Coordinates of N, CA and C in Angstrom, one line a residue:
Chain A
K1 N 1.0 -1.1 0.0 CA -0.2 -0.2 0.1 C 0.9 1.5 0.2
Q2 N 0.1 2.4 0.0 CA 1.0 3.7 0.2 C 0.3 4.9 0.8
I3 N 0.7 5.8 1.1 CA -0.1 6.9 1.8 C -1.0 7.7 1.1
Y4 N -2.2 8.1 1.5 CA -3.1 8.7 0.6 C -3.5 10.0 1.5
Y5 N -3.4 11.1 1.1 CA -4.2 12.3 1.5 C -5.3 12.6 1.1
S6 N -6.0 13.0 1.8 CA -7.6 13.5 1.3 C -7.5 15.0 0.8
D7 N -8.8 15.5 0.6 CA -9.1 16.9 0.0 C -9.0 17.7 1.3
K8 N -8.9 19.1 1.2 CA -9.1 19.8 2.4 C -10.5 20.1 2.4
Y9 N -10.8 20.3 3.7 CA -12.1 20.8 4.3 C -12.1 21.9 5.4
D10 N -12.3 23.0 5.1 CA -12.3 24.0 6.4 C -13.6 24.6 6.9
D11 N -13.2 24.8 8.1 CA -14.2 25.5 8.8 C -14.0 27.1 9.0
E12 N -14.6 27.6 10.0 CA -14.6 29.3 10.6 C -13.0 29.4 10.8
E13 N -11.8 28.4 10.8 CA -10.6 28.9 11.5 C -9.7 27.7 11.1
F14 N -9.9 26.8 10.6 CA -9.2 25.6 10.3 C -9.3 24.8 9.0
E15 N -8.2 24.9 8.0 CA -8.3 24.0 6.8 C -8.0 22.3 7.5
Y16 N -8.9 21.6 7.0 CA -8.7 20.5 7.5 C -8.2 19.2 6.6
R17 N -7.9 18.2 6.9 CA -7.4 17.2 5.7 C -6.9 15.9 6.7
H18 N -6.9 14.8 6.3 CA -6.5 13.5 6.9 C -5.6 12.9 6.1
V19 N -4.7 12.2 6.3 CA -4.0 11.0 5.9 C -4.3 9.6 6.1
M20 N -4.2 8.8 4.9 CA -4.5 7.2 5.1 C -3.3 6.5 5.3
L21 N -3.0 5.9 6.5 CA -1.6 5.0 6.4 C -2.1 3.6 6.2
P22 N -0.8 3.2 5.5 CA -1.0 1.5 5.1 C -1.0 0.8 6.5
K23 N -2.0 -0.1 6.8 CA -2.0 -0.8 8.0 C -0.3 -1.3 8.7
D24 N 0.3 -1.2 7.4 CA 2.0 -1.6 7.6 C 2.5 -0.8 8.4
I25 N 2.3 0.6 8.3 CA 2.9 1.5 9.3 C 2.0 2.2 10.3
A26 N 0.8 1.7 10.2 CA -0.3 2.3 11.2 C 0.3 1.8 12.6
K27 N 0.7 0.5 12.5 CA 1.2 0.1 14.0 C 2.4 0.6 14.5
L28 N 2.5 2.1 14.2 CA 3.6 2.8 14.9 C 3.1 4.1 15.2
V29 N 1.9 4.3 15.0 CA 1.2 5.5 15.6 C 0.9 5.1 16.9
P30 N 1.7 6.0 17.8 CA 1.5 5.8 19.2 C 0.0 6.3 19.6
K31 N -0.5 5.4 20.6 CA -1.9 5.4 20.9 C -2.2 6.4 21.9
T32 N -1.0 6.7 22.7 CA -1.2 7.6 23.7 C -0.9 8.9 23.8
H33 N -0.3 9.4 22.7 CA -0.2 10.9 22.6 C -0.1 11.2 21.3
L34 N -0.4 12.7 20.8 CA -0.6 13.1 19.4 C 1.1 13.0 19.1
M35 N 1.2 13.1 17.7 CA 2.6 13.2 17.1 C 3.1 14.4 16.8
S36 N 4.5 14.6 17.0 CA 4.9 15.9 16.9 C 5.3 16.1 15.5
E37 N 5.4 17.3 14.9 CA 5.6 17.8 13.5 C 6.7 16.7 13.3
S38 N 8.0 16.6 13.8 CA 9.0 15.8 13.7 C 8.8 14.3 13.7
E39 N 7.8 14.0 14.4 CA 7.1 12.5 14.7 C 6.5 12.0 13.5
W40 N 5.5 12.6 12.9 CA 4.7 12.2 12.3 C 5.7 12.3 10.7
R41 N 6.7 13.2 10.4 CA 7.5 13.2 9.2 C 8.2 11.8 9.2
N42 N 8.7 11.4 10.3 CA 9.6 10.5 10.2 C 8.6 9.2 10.1
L43 N 7.4 9.2 9.7 CA 6.6 7.8 9.5 C 6.6 7.8 8.0
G44 N 6.5 9.1 7.3 CA 6.5 9.0 5.8 C 5.5 10.2 5.2
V45 N 4.6 10.7 6.0 CA 3.7 11.9 5.7 C 4.5 12.9 5.3
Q46 N 4.4 13.3 4.1 CA 5.1 14.5 3.5 C 4.0 15.5 3.4
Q47 N 3.9 16.8 4.0 CA 2.9 17.8 3.7 C 3.7 19.0 3.7
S48 N 2.9 20.0 3.8 CA 3.4 21.5 3.5 C 3.9 21.7 5.3
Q49 N 3.6 23.1 5.7 CA 3.9 23.1 6.9 C 2.6 23.8 7.8
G50 N 2.6 23.7 9.1 CA 1.4 24.3 9.7 C 0.6 23.3 9.8
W51 N 0.8 22.1 9.3 CA -0.3 21.2 9.5 C 0.2 20.4 10.4
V52 N -0.7 20.4 11.5 CA -0.3 19.8 12.6 C -1.4 18.6 13.2
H53 N -1.0 17.5 13.8 CA -1.6 16.5 14.0 C -2.6 16.7 15.3
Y54 N -3.9 17.3 15.1 CA -4.8 17.8 16.3 C -5.6 16.7 17.1
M55 N -5.8 15.5 16.5 CA -6.6 14.7 17.5 C -6.3 13.2 17.3
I56 N -6.5 12.7 18.4 CA -6.1 11.1 18.4 C -7.3 10.2 18.2
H57 N -7.1 9.3 17.4 CA -8.5 8.6 16.9 C -8.0 6.9 17.4
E58 N -8.6 6.6 18.4 CA -8.5 5.4 19.0 C -9.2 4.3 18.0
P59 N -10.7 4.5 17.5 CA -11.3 3.6 16.7 C -10.4 3.2 15.6
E60 N -10.2 4.2 14.3 CA -9.5 3.9 13.2 C -8.0 4.7 13.1
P61 N -7.0 3.8 13.9 CA -5.6 4.1 13.9 C -4.8 4.6 12.7
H62 N -5.5 3.9 11.4 CA -4.6 4.2 10.3 C -5.4 5.6 9.6
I63 N -5.9 6.5 10.2 CA -6.4 7.8 9.7 C -5.9 8.7 10.8
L64 N -4.9 9.8 10.2 CA -4.4 10.6 11.0 C -5.1 12.0 10.6
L65 N -5.7 12.6 11.5 CA -6.4 14.1 11.3 C -5.4 15.2 11.4
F66 N -5.5 15.9 10.5 CA -4.8 16.9 10.4 C -5.3 18.4 10.3
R67 N -4.6 19.5 10.7 CA -5.2 20.7 11.0 C -4.2 21.8 10.6
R68 N -4.7 22.9 10.5 CA -3.8 24.2 10.0 C -4.7 25.4 10.0
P69 N -4.3 26.4 10.4 CA -5.1 27.5 10.4 C -5.3 28.2 9.0
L70 N -6.3 28.4 8.5 CA -6.7 28.8 7.4 C -5.5 29.8 6.6
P71 N -4.9 29.3 5.4 CA -3.9 30.0 4.6 C -3.0 31.3 5.1
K72 N -2.2 31.0 6.1 CA -1.3 32.3 6.6 C -2.2 33.5 6.9
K73 N -3.7 33.2 7.4 CA -4.1 34.5 7.5 C -4.0 35.1 9.1
Chain B
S1 N -18.1 8.4 5.5 CA -17.0 9.2 4.6 C -16.9 10.4 4.1
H2 N -16.2 11.3 5.1 CA -16.5 12.6 5.0 C -15.3 13.1 3.6
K3 N -14.9 12.3 3.2 CA -13.9 12.0 2.3 C -13.7 11.1 1.5
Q4 N -13.5 10.8 0.1 CA -13.7 9.7 -0.7 C -12.2 9.6 -1.8
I5 N -11.9 10.9 -2.4 CA -10.8 10.9 -3.3 C -9.6 10.9 -2.3
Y6 N -8.4 10.6 -2.7 CA -7.2 10.3 -2.1 C -6.2 10.6 -3.2
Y7 N -5.1 11.4 -2.8 CA -4.1 11.7 -3.5 C -2.7 11.0 -3.1
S8 N -1.9 10.7 -3.7 CA -0.9 9.8 -3.3 C 0.4 10.9 -3.1
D9 N 1.6 10.3 -2.6 CA 2.6 11.5 -2.5 C 3.2 11.6 -4.0
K10 N 4.0 12.7 -4.1 CA 4.5 13.4 -5.3 C 5.8 12.6 -5.7
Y11 N 5.7 11.4 -6.1 CA 6.9 10.6 -6.2 C 7.6 11.4 -7.6
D12 N 8.7 11.6 -7.6 CA 9.2 12.4 -8.9 C 10.8 11.8 -9.4
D13 N 11.3 12.7 -10.5 CA 12.5 12.1 -10.8 C 12.9 13.4 -11.5
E14 N 14.2 13.3 -11.9 CA 14.9 14.7 -12.6 C 14.5 14.8 -13.9
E15 N 13.1 15.0 -14.1 CA 12.7 15.1 -15.4 C 11.1 15.5 -15.1
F16 N 10.2 14.4 -14.5 CA 8.9 14.9 -14.4 C 8.6 14.6 -12.8
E17 N 7.4 15.1 -12.4 CA 7.1 15.1 -10.8 C 5.7 14.5 -11.1
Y18 N 5.6 13.3 -10.3 CA 4.3 12.4 -10.6 C 3.4 12.4 -9.3
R19 N 2.3 11.6 -9.4 CA 1.1 11.8 -8.5 C 0.3 11.2 -9.1
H20 N -1.0 10.7 -8.5 CA -1.9 9.9 -8.7 C -3.3 10.0 -8.1
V21 N -4.4 10.6 -8.6 CA -5.5 11.0 -7.6 C -6.2 9.6 -7.5
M22 N -7.0 9.2 -6.8 CA -7.8 7.9 -6.7 C -9.2 8.1 -6.5
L23 N -10.0 8.0 -7.3 CA -11.5 8.4 -7.4 C -12.2 7.0 -7.0
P24 N -13.3 7.2 -6.1 CA -14.2 6.1 -5.6 C -14.6 5.4 -7.0
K25 N -14.6 4.1 -6.8 CA -15.2 3.2 -8.0 C -16.5 3.6 -8.4
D26 N -17.2 4.2 -7.5 CA -18.8 4.9 -8.1 C -18.8 6.1 -8.8
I27 N -17.4 6.2 -9.6 CA -17.2 7.3 -10.3 C -16.5 7.4 -11.5
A28 N -15.7 6.0 -11.7 CA -14.8 5.6 -12.5 C -15.5 5.8 -14.0
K29 N -16.8 5.5 -14.2 CA -17.5 5.7 -15.4 C -17.7 7.2 -15.9
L30 N -17.6 8.0 -15.2 CA -17.6 9.4 -15.5 C -16.4 10.0 -16.1
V31 N -15.4 8.9 -15.9 CA -14.0 9.3 -16.5 C -14.0 9.0 -18.0
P32 N -13.9 10.0 -18.8 CA -13.7 9.7 -20.2 C -12.7 8.6 -20.7
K33 N -13.5 7.5 -21.2 CA -12.9 6.3 -21.8 C -11.9 6.4 -22.8
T34 N -12.5 7.2 -23.7 CA -11.4 7.4 -25.1 C -10.3 8.5 -25.1
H35 N -10.4 9.5 -24.4 CA -9.4 10.6 -24.4 C -8.8 10.8 -23.1
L36 N -7.8 11.6 -23.1 CA -7.1 12.3 -22.1 C -7.8 13.5 -21.7
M37 N -7.9 13.7 -19.9 CA -8.8 15.0 -19.9 C -7.8 16.3 -20.0
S38 N -8.8 17.3 -20.0 CA -7.7 18.7 -19.7 C -8.2 19.0 -18.6
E39 N -7.6 20.2 -18.0 CA -7.9 20.6 -16.5 C -9.3 20.7 -16.3
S40 N -10.0 21.3 -17.0 CA -11.5 21.4 -16.9 C -12.1 20.2 -16.7
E41 N -11.8 19.3 -17.6 CA -12.5 18.0 -17.4 C -12.2 17.1 -16.1
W42 N -10.9 17.1 -15.6 CA -10.7 16.4 -14.1 C -10.8 17.2 -13.2
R43 N -11.0 18.7 -13.2 CA -11.7 19.5 -12.3 C -12.9 19.3 -11.8
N44 N -13.9 18.8 -13.1 CA -15.1 18.5 -12.9 C -15.7 17.5 -12.2
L45 N -14.5 16.3 -12.1 CA -14.5 15.0 -11.4 C -14.5 15.5 -10.0
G46 N -14.0 16.7 -9.5 CA -13.9 16.9 -8.2 C -12.5 17.1 -7.6
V47 N -11.5 16.7 -8.8 CA -9.9 16.4 -8.4 C -9.4 17.8 -8.3
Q48 N -9.1 18.0 -7.0 CA -8.6 19.6 -6.8 C -7.0 19.3 -6.4
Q49 N -6.2 20.2 -7.3 CA -4.6 20.1 -7.1 C -4.3 21.4 -8.1
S50 N -3.0 21.5 -8.0 CA -2.2 22.7 -8.6 C -2.6 22.3 -10.0
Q51 N -2.8 23.7 -10.6 CA -3.2 23.9 -11.9 C -2.0 23.3 -13.1
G52 N -0.7 23.1 -12.8 CA 0.2 22.6 -13.4 C 0.2 21.3 -13.9
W53 N -0.8 20.3 -13.1 CA -0.8 19.1 -13.2 C -1.4 18.6 -14.8
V54 N -0.8 17.3 -15.3 CA -1.4 17.1 -16.4 C -1.7 15.8 -16.5
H55 N -2.7 15.3 -17.2 CA -3.3 13.9 -17.3 C -2.7 13.3 -18.4
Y56 N -1.6 12.4 -18.0 CA -0.5 12.1 -19.0 C -1.0 10.4 -19.7
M57 N -1.7 9.9 -18.9 CA -2.1 8.4 -19.1 C -3.3 8.0 -18.3
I58 N -3.9 6.9 -18.9 CA -5.0 6.1 -18.4 C -4.6 5.1 -17.8
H59 N -4.8 4.8 -16.7 CA -4.4 3.5 -15.9 C -5.2 2.2 -16.5
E60 N -4.9 1.8 -17.3 CA -5.6 0.7 -17.9 C -6.3 -0.5 -16.9
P61 N -5.4 -1.4 -16.2 CA -6.0 -2.3 -15.3 C -7.0 -1.8 -14.2
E62 N -6.8 -0.7 -13.6 CA -7.7 -0.2 -12.7 C -8.0 1.4 -12.9
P63 N -8.8 1.6 -14.1 CA -9.3 2.8 -14.5 C -9.7 3.9 -13.5
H64 N -10.4 3.6 -12.2 CA -10.7 4.5 -11.2 C -9.5 5.4 -10.6
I65 N -8.2 5.0 -11.2 CA -7.0 5.6 -10.5 C -6.6 6.5 -11.8
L66 N -6.6 8.0 -11.3 CA -6.1 9.1 -12.3 C -4.3 9.3 -12.3
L67 N -3.7 9.2 -13.4 CA -2.4 9.5 -13.4 C -1.9 10.6 -13.8
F68 N -1.6 11.7 -12.9 CA -1.0 13.0 -13.3 C 0.4 13.0 -13.1
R69 N 0.8 14.4 -14.0 CA 2.3 14.4 -13.9 C 2.5 15.8 -14.2
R70 N 3.6 16.7 -13.8 CA 3.8 18.0 -14.2 C 5.3 18.1 -14.4
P71 N 5.8 19.2 -15.3 CA 7.3 19.0 -15.3 C 8.0 19.8 -14.0
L72 N 9.0 19.1 -14.1 CA 10.0 19.7 -13.1 C 10.8 20.5 -13.6
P73 N 11.4 22.0 -13.3 CA 12.2 22.8 -13.7 C 13.5 22.5 -13.5
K74 N 14.4 23.5 -14.0 CA 15.9 23.3 -14.2 C 16.4 22.5 -15.2
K75 N 16.4 23.0 -16.4 CA 16.9 22.6 -17.6 C 16.0 22.3 -18.6
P76 N 15.0 22.7 -18.9 CA 14.5 24.4 -18.7 C 13.5 24.1 -17.3

């Protein structure tokens, strides 16, 4: 498999997006704490900047929810 | 599923920058069977990406997958 990034969906202050990890590397996503910008890059998830892991997902561990405030506004 | 379309990483080389959008199989049919798309055509599918992308090939085996590519600068 490979990593797939979705389309962005934004709200009143955040441009949203989530990554789809192959179950292969999903078993490296810590379940106890959010990943640091430096942490997820080490996984394989290449993105721009300002994209930060904002929420832990216990149900579906292969989905990394990312956030970032609207385009350097 | 608040999302269905998926973009892969920009695997590139010293000539062209690649990527490939992945449509949900419930749309493969709206994808022109006989010709390559124009920016307008794929944007219509809902594929959102940088303007410079170009539909250079139809993925025969599994058609629901769009194959884009763009030129990588430096010579020229």
